[PDB]
Every structure is written in structure tokens, then in C-alpha cells.
């Protein structure tokens, strides 16, 4: 608990800069045609945005109400992640943002979603570290792999077939490395001997590592199925919105319960 | 116990819902709903999205029930679980099934009897919940729950009458909604007093945030209906505001009581 606030502030500045450049480099005629070919996309982003707004509301009430200083700090990090997600989705619904066209279908690659993911996923992993009192170097290395992972995802969408294949597969492979080590550090902390004691009970550490595996796995699955031609773009965008929301509010639902218990 | 009673209320809610959903399926015109969803392409997304939101809202209420700081906390978090669940499946239904609907006199826009059905099962139940929070007289709670139910039916009926009977039934509805909000505001007030016995299960500040939440959120429905019937917003813009309002009205109550549990 040494100003999560500072982490949240750095998050916001990186976001605004990226949002800045996405506005300045946008092609508005291009975005008009994307939203005209795909008429459900504004609704999806709009709806997701409102959802995270209310999600951020709930996290604020968890912060202002320190049942513990341990559980003040953890509710603070979720407030920023959910807020970042809120405004990124508002942006996607309302503004003309620069985007890539993918090699496989010529579908749009939303750099704002990838930007959100790169600011928030490594922060969610750092949050996993506080919950489990993990080694700071072990947390750092997964936060890094996660960031490289996501960039891999984005890059892979604009390469030809074989370099596309390799970068996606390497990405996917790092995602396994990440989920395994995340699973590990929650496990180290579930042990009866473990010092220092974790700020959450044994059961809640387990529900958290299960939540991350179930929710986060949907993104690689959507990307695989859409790139191959098995779902269309809009069906994938829907699953992504539900997944994004699920991944984040899932963590705030499980810690609301910890407060109620203690 | 009172937990058994909340369960029983929830069960009656589910049976009334299924019957109404039943008849809406049996009497649907599928060619009609295909044309409605073809003229208005955002409607499935709105209902779908709202549905997922209430599902997660119902998730949060379950964790509040299993984890009740006190038994009154269990009773109050239990009632919100059923209301949010009812809302969840009503919206899933609207997105996925062909449901019988009315065409309104003013625009020939669809009147979703499933939304009205949800409202009639849940709004009177939310008012009864306001009673437990404020330890109000049972007859005062009953009379607002009744007026609220008649109110909503008034809303629905008014959409399929000609101009002057339409006008009177809507205005009488609107008028009862004022009567309801005033008396709701009252019973929370009686309970905020320092002398009040028996002590309310929520602190003074939270009783105030609740009566403010209901007034802000619930007032959006009559406003959407007024503005759409007159031609100032189109149908889809109104449906969006309704979805956001419905969700807001309900999860607003669960956000404020999550805080009461945290406070000790
Ligand atoms: C360079 C210093 C200038 C000082 C001001 C700060 C802003 C700088 C940042 C981005 C400028 C974007 C310029 C790139 C070219 C225009 C992008 C654009 O208009 O998109 C049009 C579309 O692609 C076809 O019509
Ligand atoms: C928190 C509950 C879940 C979230 C809310 C569920 C209801 C969705 C309604 C509005 C979303 C925000 C407004 C977005 C409305 C659609 C945007 C729009 O209408 O765009 C024009 C269209 O793309 C041209 O064909
Ligand atoms: C639409 C409005 C509805 C409300 C939802 C907001 C929308 C999200 C906005 C920004 C993201 C960053 C928000 C970060 C919140 C951090 C909360 C916190 O920890 O604040 C501490 C204290 O109250 C003060 O110093
Ligand atoms: C690679 C990792 C993926 C994460 C993505 C988040 C960051 C995007 C921010 C800025 C790029 C904008 C600059 C684009 C310049 C456009 C070229 C152009 O049109 O000029 C001729
Ligand atoms: C905890 C459980 C974790 C398990 C994982 C959950 C499910 C992952 C779903 C899909 C991964 C697909 C990866 C397969 C390798 C990629 C094939 C491919 O990339 O297709 C070529 C295309 O050109 C683009 O480059
Ligand atoms: C398919 C790619 C699988 C990647 C394997 C990750 C394994 C991480 C576990 C232990 C490492 C011990 C140091
Ligand atoms: C095929 C690839 C799919 C990827 C699947 C990723 C999900 C990880 C699941 C299990 C890892 C099991 C081995 C990790 C061992 C550490 C955890 C442990 O021992 O559990 C804690 C114990 O209960 C406290 O006392
Ligand atoms: C309204 C028709 C009542 C006649 C049938 C007797 C059933 C009595 C039990 C529960 C109803 C109260 C529901 C309150 C909502 C919580
Ligand atoms: C919790 C917020 C939910 C956000 C998810 C929005 C998209 C989901 C829509 C499904 C029906 C779409 C059918 C056309
Ligand atoms: C998570 C997805 C939800 C999807 C939507 C489906 C409809 C849900 C309706 C009710 C939910 C459960 C209500 C919680 C039960 C509390 C009452 C209780 O269990 O106590 C009574 C006691 O057991 C006496 O026998
Ligand atoms: C306890 C309050 C319960 C009272 C409810 C009374 C219902 C009114 C009957 C309507 C007839 C039609 C019903 C089926 C058709 O223009
Ligand atoms: C047709 C099938 C039966 C479904 C009953 C409709 C229930 C409530 C809608 C409002 C009631 C007032 C209707 C005028
Ligand atoms: C469009 C035209 C419609 C007209 C406008 C809306 C009408 C307001 C409705 C109810 C107010 C309820 C009043 C407060 C509750 C009853 C007061 C009461 O009976 O108590 C005795 C008191 O001392 C004596 O004022
Ligand atoms: C579309 C427009 C919708 C119209 C919505 C109107 C809502 C009325 C709410 C409050 C009025 C307050 C005055 C009437 C009753 C006062 C009770 C009270 O405030 O009591 C608190 C205090 O503790 C005493 O000691
Ligand atoms: C808050 C948002 C979260 C947790 C988002 C998670 C995203 C992923 C784990 C994405 C994984 C991907 C791969 C492993 C390879 C293909 C591309 C990605 C980025 C979808
Ligand atoms: C859980 C959902 C809620 C709180 C729904 C509430 C609905 C209303 C308060 C509707 C009010 C109306 C009027 C006062 C006049 C016109 C008809 C209505 C039904 C739109």
C-alpha cells in the first residue's frame, strides 16, 4: 500500500498518449466504412463501456471502505484497470481511431483494445502478486511476457502466412508459460506454512487462479477461430467484449466476498 | 425463517414469469418479430448485452447472500438476486425468442409485454425490499407495491388506446408514480430519525443514498416513454436508455448495500 494511485496515474498518461496518436492518424472514411459493414460494433463497445463504468463504481466503494489496508490497495488497482477499460471502449464506440487491416480476412485490428490490454493485463498480474505475496522478480517476468505476448498477437495479424503462424504460436506458447507461473504463485501462497500470510483466504486464492484461466483463455480462442474463417468478425467482437468484462469484474466479485467473510 | 420467506417470494416470481413467457411464445407472430428486428438492427445487441450484465449482477448478489454479515443482510441480498435473475432471463428472452408484442397508437412502435412483465414482477418486489431496509408499516409498503403494479399496466394499456383515453391513463399513471416516489421517500425518512424504533438494518447515510438512487434511476422510464411517444427520440435510442436505466435502477441498490456490509 504505497500509492497504487501512482501506478494508476502512469496508466492514464500512457493511455492518453496512445489515444492521442490513434486520433491524429485515423482515416475517418475508413472507420465510417468499417462501422457501415459491421453495424453492431458501436452497440457492443457502447454497452461494454457502460458496464465497466458501473464496474468502476463498485471498485471505488470497495476502496473508500477499508475493511483492511491490504484490501483497500487491492480494490484501488481494480478501479484503474476497470476505468481504463471503460474509456478505451467509450473511445472505440464514439471516435475515429487508426486501425490495421489483417492479412487473413482484411478485418480491422483495434490498436486501442491491444493498448488497453497492454496497460491493464500486466497490472492485473502485478495485482495477483499482492494477493499471493509472490517474489517481485517472478511477477515482473510474467508482466513482461504478457506485454510481449499481446504485441505478438497484434503484429501477427499483419504478417504473411508463415511469419504470421510463428509469431501467433510463440505468443500462444508464452500465454501458457504465463498461466502456469500465475497458477504457481497462487499455489505457493495456499500452503499452510506460507509466510507472510496472504491477505485472502485459501479458497479465494483458488477461485482467482481458476477465474483468470477460464476468462483470459477466450481471447486466444476468438482470434484462432476468426482468423481461420469459422466465426465472422462481429461474433468474435461480441465474445471479446463479454470476455474482457468477465476477466475484470470476475476479480472484483471474488474480493467483495473476501471482505464479507472478514 | 425470513430467508425461507425470501426464497418463497422468489419462487412465486419465477412461476408468474414462466407462465407469461409461455403465453408470449405461443401467441407470437414470427414474421412480425423478424421485420421488427430487421427495421431495428441494434435491438438484439441491446437485450443480449443487458442480459449478460444482469447475469454478472446476479452473480454478485449470490456472493452477498452466502456471505451475509447478519441474517437481515442475507434477506436483503437474497431479494436482489431474484429481481436481477428475473431481469437477466427476461432480457435473454427478448434477444433470442419470438415474443408476442403490441403495436402502439402513436408511432406503430412495438410494446414489449415481457419488459412490462419483468417490471410488474420486480418493481413491486423492490418496493417491498425498501420496506425491510426502513422497517416501515406493512400496509404502507403494500399500497405502493399495488399502485406501482397498476401504474405499469396503465403504461402498457395507454400505448394501445386512442389519443384522449391514452392521455388520461398515462397522466393518471405518471400521477401515481409521484404518489409512489413521495411515500417511498417518506418511509426512508421515518427510519433516518435518531429516535426511530426498531433500528434500521442500514445506517442513516445509506437509507438516504437508496431513496436518491430510486428517484434518479426510476424517473428515466416515464421520461423515455414521454419523449418517444411525442416523436423527439426514435425507438432504438429509447430502447438503449431503457436497458441502461433498468440495469442502473437494480445494480444501484446492490452497490449501496455492498458498502453497508463493508462498513462496521
Ligand atoms: C508533426 C508535428 C506537427 C504538430 C502537431 C501535433 C500532431 C502530430 C502527430 C500526428 C500528426 C498526423 C499527421 C499525419 C498525416 C495526417 C493523418 C490524416 O489526416 O489521415 C488522413 C487519411 O489517412 C487520408 O486522408
Ligand atoms: C450496464 C448494462 C449493460 C450496458 C448497456 C446495455 C444496453 C446497451 C445500450 C446502450 C449502450 C451505450 C450506447 C450505444 C448505443 C448504440 C450506438 C448506436 O446506436 O450507433 C448507431 C449505429 O451503429 C448506426 O446503425
Ligand atoms: C462515467 C462516469 C462514471 C464513474 C466511473 C468513472 C469512469 C472511469 C474514468 C477514469 C479511469 C480512472 C478512475 C480511477 C479510480 C480510482 C479510485 C481511487 O482509488 O481513488 C482514491 C480517492 O478516492 C481519491 O484520491
Ligand atoms: C506494436 C504493439 C501494438 C500495441 C498498439 C498500441 C500503441 C499504438 C500507438 C501509436 C501508433 C500510431 C502511429 C501510426 C502511424 C500511421 C502511419 C501513416 O499513416 O503515415 C503515412
Ligand atoms: C488453461 C488452458 C490453456 C489452453 C489454451 C486455451 C485455448 C487456446 C485457443 C486457441 C489457441 C490456438 C493456438 C494454435 C497455434 C496457432 C495456429 C495459427 O496461428 O493459425 C495461422 C494463422 O495464419 C495466424 O498466424
Ligand atoms: C507450449 C509452450 C509451453 C511453455 C512451458 C512453460 C512452463 C513453465 C513451467 C515451469 C518452468 C520452470 C522454470
Ligand atoms: C496443456 C496446457 C494447458 C495449460 C493449463 C494452465 C493451468 C494450470 C493448471 C494446473 C497446473 C498444475 C501444476 C502447477 C503446480 C503448482 C500448483 C499447486 O501445487 O497447487 C497448490 C496447492 O493446492 C497448495 O497447497
Ligand atoms: C400477489 C398474489 C398473492 C396470492 C398468492 C399467495 C402467495 C403469497 C406468497 C408470496 C407473494 C408475495 C410476493 C412478494 C415479492 C417478494
Ligand atoms: C456485460 C456487458 C456485455 C457486453 C457485451 C456486448 C455484446 C453481447 C451481445 C450478445 C448478443 C448479440 C447478438 C447480435
Ligand atoms: C449467475 C447466473 C444467474 C442467471 C439468472 C437465473 C435466474 C436466477 C434467479 C435466482 C438466482 C438465485 C437466488 C439466490 C437464492 C437465495 C435464497 C435462498 O437460497 O434461501 C432460501 C432457503 O434456501 C429456503 O429453502
Ligand atoms: C393479489 C393481486 C392479484 C390480482 C391480479 C388480478 C388479475 C386481473 C385479471 C385480468 C384478466 C385476464 C388474465 C389473463 C388473460 O383487456
Ligand atoms: C398476451 C398474453 C398474456 C401476457 C400478459 C401481459 C402482462 C403484463 C403486461 C401489461 C398488462 C396490461 C396489458 C394491457
Ligand atoms: C398530469 C396531471 C397529474 C397531476 C400531478 C401529479 C399528482 C400528484 C399525485 C400524488 C401526490 C401525493 C401527495 C402526498 C401523499 C398524500 C398526502 C396525504 O394524504 O396526507 C395528508 C396531508 O396532510 C395532506 O397533504
Ligand atoms: C419526473 C419527476 C419525478 C418527481 C420526483 C419527486 C420525488 C419526491 C422526493 C422528495 C421530496 C421530499 C419532500 C416530501 C417528504 C419528506 C420526507 C423526508 O425528507 O424526511 C427526511 C428527514 O429525516 C425528516 O426528518
Ligand atoms: C483485461 C484484459 C485481458 C486480461 C486480456 C487478455 C488477453 C490475452 C491473454 C490474449 C491472448 C493472445 C494470445 C495468447 C495470442 C493471440 C493474440 C492474443 C493477444 C489474443
Ligand atoms: C427494475 C425496473 C424498474 C425499476 C422499472 C421501472 C419502471 C417505471 C417506474 C415506469 C414508469 C412509467 C410511468 C410512471 C408512466 C408511463 C408508463 C411507465 C411504465 C413508463
Q: Which method was used?
A: X-ray
**Residue pair A131/A208 in contact by the 8 Å Cβ criterion:** yes
Question: How many CA atoms are closer than 13 Å to the CA of B69, on its beta-carbon side?
Answer: 19
> Three-state SS for B111?
strand
Neighbours of B119 (CB within 10 A): 24
Which ligand lies nearest to the CA atom of residue A110 in the structure?
4
Task: Name the phi and psi angles at B197, rounded to 5.
Answer: -125, 140
Q: Considering CB atoms only, which of B50, B66, B255 is closest to A61?
A: B255
Query: What is the distance in A from the centroid of ligand 9 to the CA of B53?
Result: 9
Beta bridge partners of A101: A108
> Three-state SS for A101?
strand
Query: Which segments of chain A are extended strands (E)?
Result: 100-101, 108-109
Is residue B194 reached through a cis peptide bond, with omega within 30 degrees of 0 on the bond before it? no
A108 burial via Cβ count (<10 Å: 0-12, 13-18, 19+)? buried
Distances (CA, A) of B200 to B66, B251, B257: 21, 21, 13
The shortest C-alpha distance from A43 to chain B (Å) reads 7
b/e map of B198-208 (b: 16 or more CB within 10 Å)?
A: eebbbeeebbe
Task: Tell me the pairing of strands B110-111 and B102-103.
Answer: antiparallel
Tell me the C-alpha distance between B260 and B203, whole Å.
7
> Three-state SS for A109?
strand
Tell me the C-alpha distance between B223 and B116, whole Å.
16
Which ligand lies nearest to the CA atom of residue A142 in the structure?
6
Neighbours of B165 (CB within 10 A): 12
Tell me the C-alpha distance between A199 and A134, whole Å.
12
Q: Name the DSSP class of B199.
A: P
Tell me the C-alpha distance between A132 and A204, whole Å.
11
Query: Nearest 10 degrees: CA dihedral of A89, A95, A100, A101?
Result: 100
Chain A hits for B50, CB-CB cut-off 8 Å, are 47
Distances (CA, A) of B239 to B18, B169, B236: 23, 22, 5
Grid coordinates representing A85?
477499460
B25-33: long-range contacts, CB 8 A cutoff, minimum separation 24:
B25/B97, B25/B98, B25/B99, B25/B100, B26/B100, B27/B100, B28/B97, B28/B98, B28/B99, B28/B100, B29/B98, B29/B100, B30/B98, B32/B101, B33/B98, B33/B99, B33/B101
**Residue pair B37/B43 in contact by the 8 Å Cβ criterion:** yes
Query: What is the distance in A from the centroid of ligand 12 to the CA of B58?
Result: 26
Give the orientation angle of helix A233-261 with respect to helix A218-228, to 10 degrees.
170
Distances (CA, A) of B121 to A51, A71, A216, B134, B203: 24, 37, 36, 21, 28
Query: Nearest 10 degrees: CA dihedral of A135, A140, A143, A145?
Result: -110
Grid coordinates representing A151?
504485441
Tell me the C-alpha distance between A2 and A129, whole Å.
15
**Residue pair B82/B58 in contact by the 8 Å Cβ criterion:** no
Task: Name the phi and psi angles at A39, rounded to 5.
Answer: -80, -10
**Residue pair A132/A209 in contact by the 8 Å Cβ criterion:** no
Chain B hits for A241, CB-CB cut-off 8 Å, are 49
Is residue B198 reached through a cis peptide bond, with omega within 30 degrees of 0 on the bond before it? yes
Q: Which residues contact B200 (CB under 8 A, 6 or more apart)?
A: B133, B134, B135, B191, B192, B207
Beta bridge partners of A87: none
B19 burial via Cβ count (<10 Å: 0-12, 13-18, 19+)? exposed
Tell me the C-alpha distance between A182 and A169, whole Å.
20
Q: Please report which helix (H) or strand (E) contains residue B103, including its range.
A: strand B102-103
Chain B (40-99) residues lying within 8 Å, Cβ to Cβ, of chain A:
41-42, 45-46, 48-50, 52-53, 56, 59-60, 63-64, 66-69
Tell me the C-alpha distance between B29 and B74, whole Å.
42
Q: Which residues contact B70 (CB under 8 A, 6 or more apart)?
A: B201
Grid coordinates representing B180?
409512489
Distances (CA, A) of B69 to A219, A257, B24, B72: 37, 11, 41, 9
Give the orientation angle of helix B220-230 with respect to helix B163-192, to 10 degrees.
160
Tell me the C-alpha distance between A209 and A213, whole Å.
6
Tell me the C-alpha distance between A105 and A227, whole Å.
7
CATH number at residue B176: 1.20.1070.10
- Test B45 with A50 for CB contact under 8 angstroms: no
Domain enclosing residue B201, as ranges: 2-262
**Residue pair B91/B50 in contact by the 8 Å Cβ criterion:** yes
Q: Which residues contact A250 (CB under 8 A, 6 or more apart)?
A: A211, A215
- Test A65 with B41 for CB contact under 8 angstroms: no
Q: Is B44 in the pocket of ligand 9 (CB under 6 A)?
A: yes
Resolution in A: 2.6
Domain count within chain B: 1
Neighbours of B131 (CB within 10 A): 19
Amino acid at each position: 500500500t504505497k500509492e497504487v494511485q501512482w501506478q494508476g496515474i502512469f496508466m492514464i498518461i500512457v493511455w492518453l498518449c496512445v489515444m492521442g496518436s490513434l486520433i491524429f492518424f485515423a482515416n475517418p472514411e475508413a472507420s465510417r466504412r468499417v462501422f457501415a459493414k459491421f453495424s453492431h460494433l458501436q452497440s457492443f463497445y457502447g454497452a461494454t463501456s457502460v458496464a465497466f463504468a458501473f464496474a468502476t463504481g463498485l471498485d471505488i466503494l470497495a476502496y473508500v471502505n477499508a475493511v483492511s489496508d491490504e484490501k483497500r490497495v487491492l480494490s484501488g488497482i481494480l478501479a484503474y484497470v476497470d476505468g481504463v477499460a471503460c474509456i478505451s471502449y467509450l473511445s472505440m464506440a464514439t471516435l475515429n481511431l487508426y486501425f490495421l487491416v489483417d492479412s487473413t480476412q482484411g478485418n480491422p485490428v483495434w490498436l486501442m483494445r491491444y493498448a488497453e490490454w497492454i496497460i491493464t493485463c500486466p497490472t492485473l498480474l502485478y495485482w495477483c502478486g499482492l494477493a499471493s505475496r509472490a517474489d517481485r522478480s517472478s511477477v515482473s517476468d510474467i508482466a513482461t511476457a504478457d506485454a510481449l505476448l499481446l504485441a505478438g498477437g497484434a503484429l501477427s495479424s499483419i504478417l504473411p502466412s508463415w511469419p504470421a503462424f510463428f509469431v501467433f504460436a510463440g505468443s500462444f506458447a508464452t500465454y501458457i508459460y504465463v498461466m502456469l507461473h500465475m497458477w504457481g504463485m497462487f499455489g505457493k501462497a495456499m500452503q499452510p506454512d506460507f509466510q507472510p500470510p496472504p491477505p485472502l483466504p485459501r479458497h479465494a486464492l483458488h477461485l482467482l487462479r481458476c477465474e483468470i484461466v477460464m476468462s483470459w483463455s477466450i481471447f486466444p480462442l476468438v482470434e484462432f477461430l476468426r482468423r481461420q474463417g469459422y466465426i465472422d468478425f462481429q461474433v468474435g467482437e461480441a465474445m471479446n467484449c463479454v470476455a474482457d468484462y468477465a476477466a475484470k469484474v470476475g476479480l472484483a466479485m471474488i474480493m467483495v466476498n473476501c471482505n464479507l467473510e472478514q
